[PDB]
Amino acid sequence: MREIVHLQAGQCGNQIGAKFWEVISDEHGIDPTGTYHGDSDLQLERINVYYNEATGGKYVPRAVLVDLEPGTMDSVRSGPFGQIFRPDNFVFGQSGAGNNWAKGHYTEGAELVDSVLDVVRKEAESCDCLQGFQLTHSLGGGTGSGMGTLLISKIREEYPDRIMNTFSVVPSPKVSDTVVEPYNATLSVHQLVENTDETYCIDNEALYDICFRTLKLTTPTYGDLNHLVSATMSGVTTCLRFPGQLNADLRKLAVNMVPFPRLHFFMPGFAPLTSRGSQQYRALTVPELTQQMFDAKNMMAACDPRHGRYLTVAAVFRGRMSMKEVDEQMLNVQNKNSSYFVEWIPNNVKTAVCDIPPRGLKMSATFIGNSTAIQELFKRISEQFTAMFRRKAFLHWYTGEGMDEMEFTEAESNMNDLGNPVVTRGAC
Amino acid sequence: MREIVHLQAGQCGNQIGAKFWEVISDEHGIDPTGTYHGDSDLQLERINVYYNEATGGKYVPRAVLVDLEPGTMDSVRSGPFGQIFRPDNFVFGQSGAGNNWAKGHYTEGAELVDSVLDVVRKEAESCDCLQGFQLTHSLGGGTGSGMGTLLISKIREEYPDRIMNTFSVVPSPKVSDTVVEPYNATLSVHQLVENTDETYCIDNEALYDICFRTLKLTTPTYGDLNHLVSATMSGVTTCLRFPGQLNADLRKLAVNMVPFPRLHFFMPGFAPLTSRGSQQYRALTVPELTQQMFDAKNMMAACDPRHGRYLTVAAVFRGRMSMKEVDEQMLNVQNKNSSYFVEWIPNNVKTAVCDIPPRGLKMSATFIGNSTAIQELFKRISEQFTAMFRRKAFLHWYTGEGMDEMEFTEAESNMNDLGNPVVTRGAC
Amino acid sequence: RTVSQICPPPRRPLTVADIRPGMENDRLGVVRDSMFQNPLIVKAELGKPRERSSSLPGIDFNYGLYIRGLDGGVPEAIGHWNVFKQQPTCPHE
Amino acid sequence: QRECISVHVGQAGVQIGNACWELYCLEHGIQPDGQMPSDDSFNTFFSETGAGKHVPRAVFVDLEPTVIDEVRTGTYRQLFHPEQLITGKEDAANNYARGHYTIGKELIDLVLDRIRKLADQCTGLQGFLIFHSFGGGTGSGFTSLLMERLSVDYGKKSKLEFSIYPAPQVSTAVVEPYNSILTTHTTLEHSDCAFMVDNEAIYDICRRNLDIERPTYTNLNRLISQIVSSITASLRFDGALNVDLTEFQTNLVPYPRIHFPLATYAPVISAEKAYHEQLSVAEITNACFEPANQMVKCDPRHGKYMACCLLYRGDVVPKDVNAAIAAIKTKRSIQFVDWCPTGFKVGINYQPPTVVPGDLAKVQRAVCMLSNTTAIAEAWARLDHKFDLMYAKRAFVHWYVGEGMEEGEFSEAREDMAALEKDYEEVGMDSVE
Amino acid sequence: QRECISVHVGQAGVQIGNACWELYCLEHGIQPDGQMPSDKGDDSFNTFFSETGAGKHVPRAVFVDLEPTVIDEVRTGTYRQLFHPEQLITGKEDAANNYARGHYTIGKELIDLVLDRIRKLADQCTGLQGFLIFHSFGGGTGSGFTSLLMERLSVDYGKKSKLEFSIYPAPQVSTAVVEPYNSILTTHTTLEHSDCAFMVDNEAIYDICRRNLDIERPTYTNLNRLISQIVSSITASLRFDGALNVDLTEFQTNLVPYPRIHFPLATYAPVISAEKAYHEQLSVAEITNACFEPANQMVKCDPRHGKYMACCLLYRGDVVPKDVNAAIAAIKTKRSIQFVDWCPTGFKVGINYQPPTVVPGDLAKVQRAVCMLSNTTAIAEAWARLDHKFDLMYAKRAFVHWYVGEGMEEGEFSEAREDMAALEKDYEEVGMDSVE
Numbered sequence A, B: 001m002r003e004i005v006h007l008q009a010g011q012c013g014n015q016i017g018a019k020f021w022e023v024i025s026d027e028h029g030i031d032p033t034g035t036y037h038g039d040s041d042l043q044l045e046r047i048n049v050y051y052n053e054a055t056g057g058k059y060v061p062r063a064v065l066v067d068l069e070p071g072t073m074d075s076v077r078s079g080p081f082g083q084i085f086r087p088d089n090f091v092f093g094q095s096g097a098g099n100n101w102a103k104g105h106y107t108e109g110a111e112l113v114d115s116v117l118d119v120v121r122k123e124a125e126s127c128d129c130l131q132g133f134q135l136t137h138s139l140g141g142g143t144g145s146g147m148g149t150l151l152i153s154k155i156r157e158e159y160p161d162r163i164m165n166t167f168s169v170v171p172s173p174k175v176s177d178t179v180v181e182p183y184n185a186t187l188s189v190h191q192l193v194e195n196t197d198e199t200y201c202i203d204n205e206a207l208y209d210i211c212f213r214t215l216k217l218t219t220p221t222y223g224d225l226n227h228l229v230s231a232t233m234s235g236v237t238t239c240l241r242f243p244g245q246l247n248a249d250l251r252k253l254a255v256n257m258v259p260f261p262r263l264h265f266f267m268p269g270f271a272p273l274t275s276r277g278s279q280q281y282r283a284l285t286v287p288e289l290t291q292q293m294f295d296a297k298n299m300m301a302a303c304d305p306r307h308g309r310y311l312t313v314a315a316v317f318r319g320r321m322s323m324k325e326v327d328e329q330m331l332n333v334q335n336k337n338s339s340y341f342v343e344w345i346p347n348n349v350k351t352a353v354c355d356i357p358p359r360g361l362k363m364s365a366t367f368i369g370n371s372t373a374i375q376e377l378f379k380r381i382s383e384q385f386t387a388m389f390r391r392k393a394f395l396h397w398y399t400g401e402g403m404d405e406m407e408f409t410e411a412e413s414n415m416n417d418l419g420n421p422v423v424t425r426g427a428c
Numbered sequence C: 001r002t003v004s005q006i007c008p009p010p011r012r013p014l015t016v017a018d019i020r021p022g023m024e025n026d027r028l029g030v031v032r033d034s035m036f037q038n039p040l041i042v043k044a045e046l047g048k049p050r051e052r053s054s055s056l057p058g059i060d061f062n063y064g065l066y067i068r069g070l071d072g073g074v075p076e077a078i079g080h081w082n083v084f085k086q087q088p089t090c091p092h093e
Numbered sequence D: 001q002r003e004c005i006s007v008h009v010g011q012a013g014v015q016i017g018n019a020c021w022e023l024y025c026l027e028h029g030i031q032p033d034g035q036m037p038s039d040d041s042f043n044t045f046f047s048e049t050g051a052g053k054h055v056p057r058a059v060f061v062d063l064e065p066t067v068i069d070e071v072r073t074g075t076y077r078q079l080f081h082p083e084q085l086i087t088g089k090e091d092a093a094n095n096y097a098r099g100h101y102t103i104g105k106e107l108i109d110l111v112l113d114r115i116r117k118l119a120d121q122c123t124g125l126q127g128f129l130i131f132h133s134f135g136g137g138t139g140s141g142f143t144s145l146l147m148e149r150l151s152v153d154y155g156k157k158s159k160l161e162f163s164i165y166p167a168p169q170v171s172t173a174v175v176e177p178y179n180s181i182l183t184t185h186t187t188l189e190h191s192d193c194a195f196m197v198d199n200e201a202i203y204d205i206c207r208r209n210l211d212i213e214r215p216t217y218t219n220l221n222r223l224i225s226q227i228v229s230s231i232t233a234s235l236r237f238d239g240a241l242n243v244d245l246t247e248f249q250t251n252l253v254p255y256p257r258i259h260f261p262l263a264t265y266a267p268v269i270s271a272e273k274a275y276h277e278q279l280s281v282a283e284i285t286n287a288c289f290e291p292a293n294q295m296v297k298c299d300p301r302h303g304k305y306m307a308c309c310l311l312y313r314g315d316v317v318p319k320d321v322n323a324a325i326a327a328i329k330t331k332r333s334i335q336f337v338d339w340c341p342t343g344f345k346v347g348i349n350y351q352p353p354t355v356v357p358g359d360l361a362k363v364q365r366a367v368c369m370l371s372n373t374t375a376i377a378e379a380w381a382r383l384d385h386k387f388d389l390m391y392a393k394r395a396f397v398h399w400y401v402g403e404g405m406e407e408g409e410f411s412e413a414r415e416d417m418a419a420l421e422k423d424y425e426e427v428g429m430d431s432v433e
Numbered sequence E: 001q002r003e004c005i006s007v008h009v010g011q012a013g014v015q016i017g018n019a020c021w022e023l024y025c026l027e028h029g030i031q032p033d034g035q036m037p038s039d040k041g042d043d044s045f046n047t048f049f050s051e052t053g054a055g056k057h058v059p060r061a062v063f064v065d066l067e068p069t070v071i072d073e074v075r076t077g078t079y080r081q082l083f084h085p086e087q088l089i090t091g092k093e094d095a096a097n098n099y100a101r102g103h104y105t106i107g108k109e110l111i112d113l114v115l116d117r118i119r120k121l122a123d124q125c126t127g128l129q130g131f132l133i134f135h136s137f138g139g140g141t142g143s144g145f146t147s148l149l150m151e152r153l154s155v156d157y158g159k160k161s162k163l164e165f166s167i168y169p170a171p172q173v174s175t176a177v178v179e180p181y182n183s184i185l186t187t188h189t190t191l192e193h194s195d196c197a198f199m200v201d202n203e204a205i206y207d208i209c210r211r212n213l214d215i216e217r218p219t220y221t222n223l224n225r226l227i228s229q230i231v232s233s234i235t236a237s238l239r240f241d242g243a244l245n246v247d248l249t250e251f252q253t254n255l256v257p258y259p260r261i262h263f264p265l266a267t268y269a270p271v272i273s274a275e276k277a278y279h280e281q282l283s284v285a286e287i288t289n290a291c292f293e294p295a296n297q298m299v300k301c302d303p304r305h306g307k308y309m310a311c312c313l314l315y316r317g318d319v320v321p322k323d324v325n326a327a328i329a330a331i332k333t334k335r336s337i338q339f340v341d342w343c344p345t346g347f348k349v350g351i352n353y354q355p356p357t358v359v360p361g362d363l364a365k366v367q368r369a370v371c372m373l374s375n376t377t378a379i380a381e382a383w384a385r386l387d388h389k390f391d392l393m394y395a396k397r398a399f400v401h402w403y404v405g406e407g408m409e410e411g412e413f414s415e416a417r418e419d420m421a422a423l424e425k426d427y428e429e430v431g432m433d434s435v436e
């Protein structure tokens, strides 16, 4: 048996995982009170990846919830599937992070880090064979940036043979919900370079693009916005949760996706995405699923992937399917879209198929892309940072809370030293 | 049948033992009025470990209640279980405790000692083989310290080869309920170092720490604080009363957790400790019983196990659990953190498994710990002694009642010569 | 709803109804209610505390947060294990 | 849990406070005396006690009576603790010396004692709301002394200031140019962030966008009470983007010295214009950013914005404000500083404004916009020129000096404000290197 | 079983006695006539009350006062029936603000009577626990008679606990110019025999009643009633059942570090005037902080200009002990309450399960009250003030002729001055930190 421990920091990441645990509970047939009221017998066979057995029948997710503001815990307890976590893992704080990476990393975050590693230690020891951990956070903003990267650093230095999956909401080119977003982002990605094994960059502008152009929605709510994120976060972890031909768990993905130890930033995708008005005129098959996977309309990072070359493609299909077409459609993609696929990885797709799709559908597909188009996001964050670092704007807070002048330039040096390789292997 | 007598001296230990008779009345099955109202004959099998028979089956405990002031005597008499205690062994005095060690030891407190030893001798022959001596008190304060330790000294001079255990409440680093905690407590420990075989140092602040972090109370009263002490003081003597596998009596415990004759100070522990809310979502197993047994939050002392190298561990599990796991995770504890267990004692842990769970659960585990972590307790109390011994403060009452400087100097020297053998083994 | 708090009536401020002779608040010349509630026409009671500007609950009201709680304490935290009970009986219907 | 303590000093701040608690009682649900005719919503600005007589976390301190005696004989005599309504005995007489130097010592120990009592009953203290003007002697001097003492004692905690600006054109006293500079010299080094609002801009918005030519100060202060309720909204309630007071003071204060935001409010319609307009989100965002609803009469065109905090309340979907921020960024007249590309912080709350019996109509969407402009330096220079003209031949200086003032501190405050002018110019100059 | 003998000497002592017995009447079921309307099962009445044949319950006290009209107030007013008619030891001739008359000529016709009364009052005592001497440092009776009575009781029952409740002289106002001449002698004589003595300053009672009770013109009926609540809160462990029951021998082993330093100060928690108690919360943390606030202290002395040596907290009512312990931790880590460097543990804890009972009047009916009793170095300033006043009055030999022509020898003022010089030297000696 195999386990994944889910931990989350920040208001954003807490809502990420609230929608994720709702989606996983609906997929495993688990009611809000925690028991199994389901339909399929094999649906209970690998509950113990995200869930924990408890004496009588209400399973408990192996999730620890942390936030410096003690109101997001109130929100997630008052949510729909709120009475499902352990009350012991609500490791909150009597403070407010204040959108400050300094105050999430070198302060009361670092004073609560001992307790959050204690409960993470408890849930990790209560396992048998751990693949690793899952952290959901916003790369722009406080709490989930500073505490998130500190927590990743400690967990990576503690368990070096386990993989880390961080689902990060990177700041968007369109607007800015936090004014120190690139300050938080550069310092956070400095730690994300040498730590995690699987980072997934999700953009809210891309979420709007999907839900208005493809889903045809009018009032897009956050429940929908990281419902769409919960979809892919469930779609990555399905081969070790349900049976099927050609299984590929998280490490089997991570071996194939990243060619180099640092280029581990993925832009996700879900593409049986049908509007409620055009769903009734659908003819669900592998060709249009693999056509919907490969456009700049279901790509959840705010960088059009046709500004760079794909390094590695993933395709976690779900549903009862046969797959000669799932093979030759990747052949067709590599043959036609040839200027955006590398030549030094010949046949740079990975394919996996799960037996059971998400409920309410018959056949789905999760797309995980590693390209040279995250170039543009990282570069734009770099000029967005250097616009304010040149005249010391919003820096007195970090310097007062205890941060140093040289380490900001160290973070920007690592920023540019991630920017340069994704130049040179996109241009050979 | 193996018998033991339970003396309670003071205010603190008097209340602890007076409610401990209540807590074991539930496990046995006698009501307040002495009539046995139980459910199995197997509880009646060994009533004569703590309870003496009386005609009509009106079973009376053997407990010599003693105090210098007849206020706590009235408190016990007017408490919940009042019509259970023998009228003859209500030995009291029309005097004042004065929370003075010299008063309890070398003055009119010694003028009741002849009557107390007479009434102890009254049940010393109404029995078969008196294995041990329970005595409940507080090292800080009067009566329980002074007269308690003189009672210990006299009863060991009268019976030399029986094990005795003193459940004693020690002062807390954080606060102080008494200005002369050091003056009472160092003088109390001066005889306990060369006398007793099983102490149980149970501070006051860790009971509130358990009730606040673990049990999650909001108004922890003294019954709630004394009850964990009573649960440990019942669970330590369960292989002496009820059937099980790997049975161990108090002399077995003395042999296994006394490496050297002076290092016999034990850290208590009880670990089905759950809150009322997380008690729902909890998953009772011998693995997590061991986990929350060795977690440094359920231990009842201000002695950090992460700052104290362990010497001997005992675990009296109670319940119908299989033996292979209660051996296996006990091995895996030492294999996990062997650097916090001694190497000159390999195999430094003891397992006992009684058949009967405590009434109101499905299993439990009483934790007994002899570690080096009591060195910080002794160092801090020695510094508290020294800070007020520098100015000869608070000493005129002691000198008026019959103290002198050389006795306090010998007591402080014995405290330093007790702190040395509990650090020089951790230094290998 | 200050009269619903505690059963005997709230301690009304001293109206024109009492105003005993040979006492220090014995003003002459249009005596109505409102000056005895306005605190600064009110010269003090001179032996008794200053007159109220309001009506306050009676002699048998406890003051402050007196949290009674609902936990049964550690006898309920150790003397019971709430094993998972369920009410499936599903009204799916 | 997330408490915050309000101290109301001076007549202006006190009547802002009466409007504010008039608003808050109707917002939460406690009736004017203080009891609730029946959870973690009132435990932010209000405490709880015996039965239900909830007491606000406010210290109404003033040097004269008759400003607090209105509260003590009003309907609100039951809401407040009788001792936290603190009155002095002598008037400050527009004298910074009589507000900070001479008559400050008979009151400062008592007001700090009540402040530390209220802070003792705060499990989490984010910050303070300090209500006054830059005008009269009380709100000039006692404010300064309070900020010195609170910055000394509670240096790690937030102190938010709510200051009424001395109007560049109308005014009501002759020594406001003296008092404003004398109070900002000392509050610059201690106050974390000072939301500042002018009287005659509220005058303008009432005469134009509120369709009434005769509301009095009980309605002038009501808009500021709405501003305070809008700004401390995610602390009291829950929303989409909760914005915390630490978040305001970290995302609106660029440099250690530039901490003077200007507030403005979205719709101020008056119950005979509600049913004839839609009141969408893009148009109220453009209404907040258009150069006439600013609550300080300075022209935002003659300057550059630095950072703005939008706080939308009511039924607001987040992508309407996403589109509105996009449109504001594309509109050319709003000119930003080139060194700050992220110009915005969005906050969204699901709770609409409470409708007090008055003139403000029931609107289901309302955004408070705070801007940090560089056009506020023009208003600073407008006060500085008045100070220079009055200080040219020592006008009204003997009244200050005879009460304990030192002459050189006038000149010290003068080039401190000159230095603030050069800091504004230095943060406003563009990129040439 | 646990009883104390309360002697009330002089006008101040007997007025505080009238107020306190006014309190204990409604504290128990003893209606102010003597009987109890209970249809009973008690044993809490026996501490300060007897038990006659049917129900009368005479108290264990003695009102002694060398001038009449005040004992006649007692035997003319409401409470005459409750007291023994021979317990009322009135004298015949007032001591007239004169220690010489209180100690040297007119005591000898009443000292034998009052010693006899104290003796056969102690005969109705299985375990007598202490003596409660109520007086002032002012008038002739309350200085000289309490000095001589203190000497004779320390001769006769010297091993027992001895408590003084005394009205300390005012630093600014006073009521006699011979307040220093009488205080100097009564403290010089009672220093060696008093086990501990709790001080009250009328100025501080005026200010605490003006500020907290918010009362502008109340009389000594309201001065002494706070002292009544103080003594009822102190002697409550011996009356009721609680959590940390404290004995008088614990109090005396407790509140003094050294044999002669035996002057702690009282402080009473919420003293809110019931017109105000609705508007705040009266929690454990704020009542513990209100004890240490430098405005609720029962005497004028500045706590910040001094160090607390050892203090005792008597929480009474529904108080959870770990909130007390947390408030103790917060008070300990607060940096404005400085202690002596040789006393890490300086706090005492006591909890009793019986809430305060209030007479109809000033005080709010609160189910929680802590009495704080602090032995501290802050009283050295008041001692220095009184000694400087004594120096400036004695340097011209004024008002000495009434003392010396009565039978008192003139030179005792001198060695009283060096006795207080020794007391000041000791209060300075306890103040330095450890260098050795």
Ligand SMILES: Nc1nc2c(ncn2[C@@H]2O[C@H](COP(=O)(O)OP(=O)(O)OP(=O)(O)O)[C@@H](O)[C@H]2O)c(=O)[nH]1
Residues within 6 Å of the ligand: D009, D010, D011, D012, D013, D015, D016, D064, D091, D092, D093, D094, D095, D132, D133, D134, D135, D136, D137, D138, D139, D140, D164, D166, D171, D172, D173, D199, D217, D220, D221
């Ligand atoms: N909203 C509102 N603003 C006021 C009010 N009273 C005064 N102001 C403004 O405050 C400025 C000066 O008044 P204050 O600062 O309150 O004067 P003060 O605090 O009483 O100080 P002193 O004159 O010394 O007594 C005026 O220019 C007004 O613009 C008021 O009642 N409501």
Ligand SMILES: Nc1nc2c(ncn2[C@@H]2O[C@H](COP(=O)(O)OP(=O)(O)OP(=O)(O)O)[C@@H](O)[C@H]2O)c(=O)[nH]1
Residues within 6 Å of the ligand: E009, E010, E011, E012, E013, E015, E016, E067, E094, E095, E096, E097, E098, E136, E137, E138, E139, E140, E141, E142, E143, E167, E174, E175, E202, E220, E221, E223, E224
């Ligand atoms: N509680 C209370 N204290 C009083 C009263 N009258 C006087 N005192 C105090 O007593 C002091 C002066 O009176 P005393 O010292 O008691 O006089 P005395 O001890 O009776 O001796 P004589 O003057 O000879 O009668 C004043 O400083 C007051 O503090 C009173 O009516 N009630």
Ligand SMILES: Nc1nc2c(ncn2[C@@H]2O[C@H](COP(=O)(O)OP(=O)(O)O)[C@@H](O)[C@H]2O)c(=O)[nH]1
Residues within 6 Å of the ligand: A009, A010, A011, A012, A013, A015, A016, A097, A099, A138, A139, A140, A141, A142, A143, A144, A145, A169, A177, A178, A204, A207, A222, A223, A224, A225, A226, A227, A229, D240
């Ligand atoms: N997609 C989605 N996004 C959310 C949700 N809740 C919050 N967000 C996003 O969270 C981001 C801000 O998070 P952040 O400021 O870092 O919160 P913090 O971690 O508490 O500091 C915003 O840009 C929102 O887009 C949700 O339920 N679904």
Ligand SMILES: Nc1nc2c(ncn2[C@@H]2O[C@H](COP(=O)(O)OP(=O)(O)O)[C@@H](O)[C@H]2O)c(=O)[nH]1
Residues within 6 Å of the ligand: B009, B010, B011, B012, B013, B015, B016, B097, B099, B138, B140, B141, B142, B143, B144, B145, B169, B176, B177, B178, B204, B222, B223, B225, B226, B229, E243
């Ligand atoms: N666990 C527990 N501890 C208590 C209890 N009662 C008192 N204590 C502790 O006992 C200590 C003081 O008791 P002590 O002075 O020895 O009472 P004495 O024996 O009459 O002198 C305090 O620090 C209390 O924390 C109780 O009922 N249970």
